[model samples]
Target chain A: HHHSLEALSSYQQRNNQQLDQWLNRIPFQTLPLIEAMRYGLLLGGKRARPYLVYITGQMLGCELSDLDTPASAVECIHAYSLIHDDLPAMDDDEATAILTGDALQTLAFTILAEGDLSAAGETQRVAMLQALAEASGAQGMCLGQALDLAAENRLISLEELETIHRNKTGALMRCAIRLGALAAGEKGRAMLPHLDRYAEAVGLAFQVQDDILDIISDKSTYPALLGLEGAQQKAHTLLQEALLALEAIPYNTEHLEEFARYVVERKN
Target chain B: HHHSLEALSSYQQRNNQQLDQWLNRIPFQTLPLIEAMRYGLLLGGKRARPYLVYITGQMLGCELSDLDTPASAVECIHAYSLIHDDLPAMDDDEATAILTGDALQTLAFTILAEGDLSAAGETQRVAMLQALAEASGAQGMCLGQALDLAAENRLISLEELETIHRNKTGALMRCAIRLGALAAGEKGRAMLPHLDRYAEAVGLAFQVQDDILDIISDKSTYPALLGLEGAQQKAHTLLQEALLALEAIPYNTEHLEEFARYVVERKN
Candidate 1:
């Protein structure tokens, strides 16, 4: 019933390979730009989003290969967000953070439009594309980011911070779940209310955990506003809420339960 | 058969209204970020790209309503790129450039995914999304962007410049033409090669003219490589090629031919 690091690692390795393969195909003329992309994507992070895609899809009957297009896609979006976040404007140019971010962002869509996710009906892929687009764009993560950027240095209200994190992080996580379910055919969508509540809590739990990480290490978080103990309590409560949402679903959700726990409890 | 400015403006007006309506609908909490989105999108350049979507679709038998989704989407991509390109790192900005670009870019896809292009068929909408994704992403505009950013301040070959411009500006322009044709249903695709040629030449010509614009106004261009006259000739040559490609199509292309002339010969 527990999720395995081994499985996540396999997904990460395969996605990294696919990402690298796509990069390799870029013209040598644009090698530096591609290099910048490699530096960012190849850097490192939990492949949580892709795992969501895999686990949810598998639970609902999609094959592993059926999951690749969106799996790779969400990761690319995640990677691009990180790259842009790290830009001098967003962060500072490690090298071509700005330009590479642009390319990585573009690459996300390129992978989607051209990928072999035909396991999905053509219309289904459109739906998938829509989910990914909504999660990544102005209505979602970008909105979160802009809110965060605008609020810098000024201590924001707890509600404001939650809104930002929810949009910035939660949106994608929820989208990861949505896309996974959508990949499962019509049944997946039918179960969306169940999935939606679960995914939202997981996402909320993620930010609470993220906030906890920053305090433990130190940047900012749900914990900061809630107090460390209060934050920990909130994140755990959110995870439990996430589990409750899954109870009515017909499929086994043990792995997802494990993932929910993983979100709040993981360190480093 | 030449394109009427009145019709083009009508399309532009409707799209602008929709873009405005969406911006207005953003949660009041996120108003500022959305405002930034509006700032970039509402900057009021000639709506040339959207014009292509309308003219081509109409010529191929599509109604203006069917083209709005893509027409709005293409401009979103175009506007986002300009914002990014003009960033302090890329352009020289107020904080809004980066975020506005992100939001607007995201909105482009959001519009497509949410649009009621039902008249075009679900499958056709998918194709439209795919086309927009391809044009907006790395292989199209973003690739051109990274290449341009890399080549800045360095003298480059005519070929490199063309490559940059093609992907930078040309891709979306060509995509506009493609989306327009796609709006007409499947038969529109049969004439794609001919249209592709038309769009490419037009895009190339558009860039050449843009370079001339920079030169005439005293930036580095036509005067630097191709003599102004020679550059003018190149732009003219491409425009003719664009028109020639159109000759093979069944539609009356007076508007299109005029459009080609405008691409090269527009003094403004």
Candidate 2:
């Protein structure tokens, strides 16, 4: 457990260092936009998605350097989503928050489409871009948010809520694994199905845990619909499925196994 | 002149048809988000950027079908920018407008990264994705917007305003031309310097003309900054530069020449 914690901590540190370097290198004439972008992005988070990217890539024998861009790209997408979700339309944040979100979204694509991935060929790079875009756009995160917004006044069913979180947070989590797998080239590509299974369970588990934490905080969450005990059961079930999926994978998924536990066990 | 107008009309029609088909193909679960996206994008405009992509590609002997993705992608970027600019932080538009903008930006990258580009290789496709991402992000449109937002209340110089519009609008215009050139493969790239020259003058000419028309509407326009006569002179000078830049290009630039004139001469 402590070893997993150490790896996760070091990975987060590495991700931050790389992201800082990349953000610093951009030739931004608009000092304020860049500053705002830095503020929104670098303030930091669990860095869970980046952790998934790095660990998954490592499991497939991919280089840490090659995974840097994809790791950063996914975080950029996540950061943008957070920034936009805080807009007055959504949550009434800064006026500059909207623009900062817009810039970060663009930055994600820029980094994914242009960043160096020495381990993968051009074809894989293009594939990585497609994965990131598909997960970030209308079909995924935005759609989830839109559904969440539309659900404001009306009470939604359990399945409906599941769909919302699936696209909202689940899609990017899956993309993190996808990016790492793609970075590993053909070998990584082959592991997608197995990895995806693990990711789906863990992704849902992350949200269940969030709802658990929130209960311990109202927007449609598992605890609200399922009751606190039910929500806890759901998280446990999801974690069990996550570990089961990992059991089928041939490689060492010890880190991923630890991650699944951390997703539920970590207290904010 | 009539011939140029006819081609432009046909291109816009083709562009709309293609965009409609693409948007329809996306499997969006959230009906409201998709509807909002369609409403925002299909509202339509001069489609000046798409024209550049199609016309420049045609001039370089690229198939019209091959240019569809880039044309649609840039317009997505442009449309998203408009939506976000109308946000409360910026201009106080619909709450749904923010989500639509966020989704559209993602769609642009998705299309560029994934759309069929039969005329070009994977390498060229990657390059096209990079070009669109770079033009839309911080170093380009977003940076310009951030500067524009910051310039509020404070009086900015004519040069500073030019800097804003150059990144805000000019970068994408140049990218449109770049995408067309890229679609034609190596031949299109070789023409970038000349086309870029034409694009620079034409892009700025577009704003100069807008200011000229605005004298006939203003928060910091060319008319306000440079005065009506100066704005008109600036438009004429930019138009002349646009036409002169066309003179250096070794292709059938009649459409582009007519385009530069249209940039300055169009009433609306």
Candidate 3:
């Protein structure tokens, strides 16, 4: 039925534990590196991407344990993007943040290779790794960041902004779902075009909502981009396509369907 | 026969050609990013590491095309590491250098997945990707960098210096050999420890030589930590060990054996 917030939160909480356990499992000490990594990851806002892995995996009949690796891996990419983007040469967060991002990415790959994802089979595990690499690195997220860097002060068109967000925020989001599907195995991997469309709609809507919330909740306006009202409508249409994508995929759609709708509605 | 500097240079030229082809293959319009990536890579004084993939792969009877993936992938990690390492100290104008670093890593992994290494078969290919991940990330290069940063001020021991070099540089060196071995298949993988030891000594000695250079030419390195004579002795010792390691592994290793001698003795 309805996309359960309770279920989503349960997945989120469970993923946090799995993520923590991943760090715990890797028995290496790197001083304040650990301290900083823990700080960035612990205070992480919404575990939305992680949930996409779980929800998509669940729909495809994979175990929650199976989803953990991809979930943690996707989060690693997300946290890394945030940290690196903050470099002045990158972001304001400086070197320590980059170190944490690195540690997380290492842990992510560690789990995938040395931990459970390896159990997913060499082909599938490599596929997951490929997915993360593509999504996070240049052709996807980093390219988006590059374009963002180029357009920082220069005024951007709506099309350009969408292109940036699609890769910047949306690429990883799409990857997270695809990775979850891959983790779910053959049948899940087979549903990709549908899952991809679903992920695209959801990711765009999520960003539009994020932009909207920034304006409404924090007095940050994107008047040059879409303005609040236009942004909201954009998110709305995206959410509709997200739901439509679910119909063709072979899975229970209750949670994901609701997520798309819920993603656009929240002002908080 | 001696490891031919001519042969090394020959591989360098061919590898440069192949790498350029890879960049041109990806149709992305991020010039500032690409410019810096090309800059970092082109000025690369030696293709020493990439040649390890070639020499090792050749010994095992792998084709040149097969050698290209690991050769390129390892170089990507090396390039990316250098790019990101400079982030905090870098000027805002060089922000895309960071992107360049990331793009190389992305291209590296993408090629492994959708590109040639897949021809190595599922298990070996997965192992190759995993090898790169481990060597590139925390447990390998990144962790070493962390230790290097920490030891930048403190008068660390020679033992501490080696530890940093091992993870920072040695890890990838070992991975390159191992990945090449994997490309050669199971029989070659069985030779890993020997390859491992060989790479270990060479990596350390390369650093030792680097330290020697800095004293005569540039940073505190092995010479500073252990004193000049001690550092030279250590490099000489490592060169011997490196040659010995190649003795037992299955392959025609004259090139690698000669490399050990060449690495420690050569001056810029």
Candidate 4:
């Protein structure tokens, strides 16, 4: 049940190729859209989010073909978050330079300056266009980002941080889970509690691990206050809480449980 | 059917209030999200895109409520585009100073540097986050922006400019029209041709007028090379072509037709 780097790398390569094919079908004649997609998707990540969807869906008995759209959708949301998160007014990280270079920087500057004056007459790609607009614009990710920025260098109470993380990170994770469920044709308000429990635990654990990693590992992150051991303990406690929440479900959830564990234990 | 500024202003105020109400319902604890929403939505514009959705939906025998979602959606997209378009790297104008701040001189850098990154994340809102990511990121607006930056001060073929406009402006306009139809419950694949036709003509004509405005109007825009009169002539030609495409629709499209005319002749 342990993951081997060799096997994971192979799986990643195959999945990346598959992802490239699906995305390539989207016309790239529009350079900014293509570049933004590339910046968000192709730039590189472990593809952990989508992998979770694929793995969890498989464990749930979903066919591989049936998982593609959901997997892509999850990755798309994840990618979008990264793009907006890295903006200057948000995390204000110079490290994003290592990721998207001047592309995102350039984009960030354009969007902030022009506001809506520049969109004087576009009428075609409005729905998809608006969906993106609202998501990344002030009402969506930026708002989450503002909350995050406000929390930095301050002792945010647990409740405050939870609300912030829910919007900042959990929102996208929830989207992933919901999208997976939707793609699988499972409906109803009945499943929401399970998804929320899973999303809440995983999301907090994600932040907890990052906090731990910043201290224990070389990577720079949000660990200035919590310290390494404190962060690790927090993550473990949250993971346990997550697993306990899933006990009511009759189905096997070993993969998700394992993922929750691995999320806290990862090295890089 | 022509709309006066006063009428348009009245509709805009009403829509703005409605938009504010919808946004206000989001949890107040998530202040960043609210701040970004306010920054983008309240920044100010004519709300022309939403007006089109409202007017066209009414003409198509739909209720005002039916158009609400699309109207808000298109404005969001339009707002996102303008924020990006005004960035220092693109047009690099001092005019953005009116909205953002003093020019690069005040920031000790580019004009885009002053933009509120918080507002930029609006494109990545939690609901429909993935679609927003795709449309605003590289494949949609960002790609169009890159093309626009590259094309600036250079001799771009009409096809290239059209391609840019298609991504930059057309994509969102099409989204608006599609969302309007969707709001009215026009879901099947059968509605695409009509939607596409309506979107294409409107998108091109909108950009054409924009080009013309840059030259003839007091505002700064992309008329330095094409010249004012040439841009006007081009706009008129595009409008004619747009009107011709509308002939294919057998349904009542009086509002849409009027919108096309209003956009070109608009003084502001």
* TM-score for chain B of all predictions: 0.91, 0.93, 0.91, 0.72
lDDT tens per residue, model 2, B215-242: 7854778888988998999999998898
iRMSD in angstroms, per model: 2.4, 1.3, 2.4, 12.8
| lDDT tens readout by residue for model 4, B150-231 | 6766777767878888877776666556544444343312355765676777787777776665556552243544577767
| lDDT values, one for every candidate | 0.77, 0.84, 0.76, 0.52
Query: Which structure among the candidates has the greatest DockQ?
Result: 2
Please provide, for model 2 over A79-102, each residue's C-alpha lDDT reduced to its tens digit, 9 standing for 90 to 100.
988887766667742667887888
Comparing 1 and 2 on lDDT, the stronger one: 2
- The Cα RMSD across the true interface for model 3 is 2.4
Cα-based TM-score, every candidate: 0.93, 0.95, 0.93, 0.74
Give, for candidate 1 chain B, the lowest lDDT window spanning 10 residues: B1-10
Name model 4 segments beyond 4 Å from true.
A4-11, A29-36, A87-143, A155-166, A187-189, A217-231, B4-7, B29-33, B88-140, B185-195, B210-214, B217-231
Total clashing pairs for each candidate: 14, 3, 5, 56
Q: Candidate 4: lDDT of B161?
A: 78
> Model 3: per-residue lDDT, tens digit, B93-184?
56676667767777777766665743443448767777888787767887787777777777777688789889988998888888777876
lDDT of 1 at A246: 90
- Model 3 Cα lDDT, one tens digit per residue, A1-268: 2345566678778777877876664435546666667667766767888988888888888887777888887887777667666666655235666666766665666666655743443348877877887787766887788778776777777778778778888899999889888986777778999989998888877777877777676522244366667777778889889988999976688878877877887645
Off by over 4 Å in 2: A1-6, A28-30, A216-219, B1-6, B28-30, B217-219
Residue pairs in candidate 3 whose N, alpha carbon or C atoms collide under 3 angstroms:
A86-A91, A86-A92, A87-A90, A87-A91, A88-A91
Tens-digit lDDT string for candidate 1 (B1-268): 2345455676678778867766765665445767767877887577888888888888888777777777888888888887777666665335556767776777787777777663653447767777877777666776777777657778888888888888888888889888888877787777789999998998888778877887787533554678888998898889879889999999878788888887776666
